[PDB]
Amino acid sequence: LPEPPRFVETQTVKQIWTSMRFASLTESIAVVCGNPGVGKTEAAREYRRTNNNVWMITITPSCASVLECLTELAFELGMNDAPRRKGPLSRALRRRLEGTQGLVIIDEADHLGAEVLEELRLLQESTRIGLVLMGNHRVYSNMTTVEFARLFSRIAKRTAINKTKKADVKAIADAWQINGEKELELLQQIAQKPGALRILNHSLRLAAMTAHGKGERVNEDYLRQAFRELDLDVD
Amino acid sequence: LPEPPRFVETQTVKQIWTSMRFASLTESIAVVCGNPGVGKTEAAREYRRTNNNVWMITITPSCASVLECLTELAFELGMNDAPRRKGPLSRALRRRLEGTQGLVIIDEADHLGAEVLEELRLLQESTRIGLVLMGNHRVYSNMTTVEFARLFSRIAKRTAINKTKKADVKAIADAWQINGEKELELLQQIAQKPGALRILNHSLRLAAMTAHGKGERVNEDYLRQAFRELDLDVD
Ligand SMILES: Nc1ncnc2c1ncn2[C@@H]1O[C@H](COP(=O)(O)OP(=O)(O)O)[C@@H](O)[C@H]1O
Ligand SMILES: Nc1ncnc2c1ncn2[C@@H]1O[C@H](COP(=O)(O)OP(=O)(O)O)[C@@H](O)[C@H]1O
């Protein structure tokens, strides 16, 4: 019956915002490698929505060149007059982006070319801004250090989020007005399976729409039917 | 008038033999990077002459492949029936060389390919023998560690010989029957200039042949004329 809230502040959200503002004021590189679907991507957008001098792209592996990725960052900076060459684009980024005290957020940092991440790290360095890397744990695996040596020397605050915590789903249940202890344990058990935040959010939205269509309150059995869907135990 | 001695035991010779026997009994890798002409090449040959289960090649950059270098080591092992392919040669080295408790000495380790030194390190490891690297200080510079990471994990005893010592040239003067303190200081000053052992040996041999041709004893002025040759201050 109430409006579903899309985003909730969580212990991971608190941690990752402190890491984000750390790389902001620190003006240095923060790599966030974690298990898939730990909720990092969404929080980054909440940081972008709440804070000034913040930018974010995503990297599809289609846009995984230096040219394409810097073009993406340039259009995110609003310079629609960006040149299609590498060089003058790099110069335009260097003139535009330095002195703003900003924070670049880059998601899926595993698909970075060495020249790609190389130009990014030398950018932020020659720009006095923030760069923050996201994605899975292949990002730190791509460094483990003569090709990534000075970059491993840059690294300010890595934060690994493997899975959720109990206060994480507890604040989730607080935001979704969930009071059952059986409900809380079931939410925790759903959080034990991967795609944690996503599956939990899906399960929450299934139960909310089912209880709204039936005119009832979200309860434990709606959550059981929701989790009984999705083919999680079906190969 | 006496016979010139070709080789003299020296503090560097003592140090480097202890490093050599260390990598022998240890059956592990010892990198000897030093200034050019520190006398390391000759001592290695004295170790080869005095000790059993010892082998040595040199690496010209002509023979700088895996195939050519392992062929050189194979002919040094006396297997003249060595195959001209990489694989069966590697197998023949693996069968021949394991169980002998030997010591391979490799000179000019700066011209090693990554596959070359790679096959050498995996050889000694799969062979329970000794490998010892020689040459200038570019050998350690080629490692400074994801391409050379496990190799930098192998390293047992690096010994850097930059220049000579005073007991070095003192034992040289003892072997060459030199008693002058002016002579000793002049020998030390010659040792301060690069190509130390080589120039000193050249100077010793110039003075010996000049004093033998003039029927006299080697003295300070013959050493001065010898050092006045060679165009050391002439560009
Ligand atoms: N605080 C939150 N509240 C609700 N859903 C969240 C929250 N944080 C993340 N999510 C969910 O996580 C997903 C977005 O991030 P996600 O895809 O998990 O990132 P990544 O795949 O990079 O780990 C969406 O399902 C989103 O609803
Ligand atoms: N103990 C020694 N006695 C006399 N000459 C020596 C001695 N050790 C080295 N040398 C001289 O050094 C040279 C051989 O080694 P060298 O060429 O200096 O090795 P590297 O070039 O690898 O440093 C020759 O000039 C040799 O006569």
Curated annotation (Swiss-Prot), chains A, B:
Cofactor dependence: Mg(2+)
Keywords: ATP-binding, DNA integration, DNA replication, DNA-binding, Early protein, Host cytoplasm, Hydrolase, Magnesium, Metal-binding, Nucleotide-binding, Transposition, Viral DNA replication
Listed GO biological process terms: DNA integration; DNA replication; DNA transposition; viral DNA genome replication
Effect of R121A: 20 fold decrease in ATPase activity due to impaired ATP hydrolysis
Record family assignment: Belongs to the AAA ATPase family.
Quaternary structure and partners: Homomultimer. Polymerizes in presence of ATP, preferentially on DNA. ATP hydrolysis triggers polymers dissassembly. Interacts with DDE-recombinase A; this interaction stimulates the catalytic activity of the latter as well as the ATPase activity of MuB followed by its dissociation from DNA.
Official protein name in the record: ATP-dependent target DNA activator B
Species per Swiss-Prot/TrEMBL record: Escherichia phage Mu (Bacteriophage Mu)
The encoding gene: B
Section of the entire sequence shown: 67 to 305 of 312
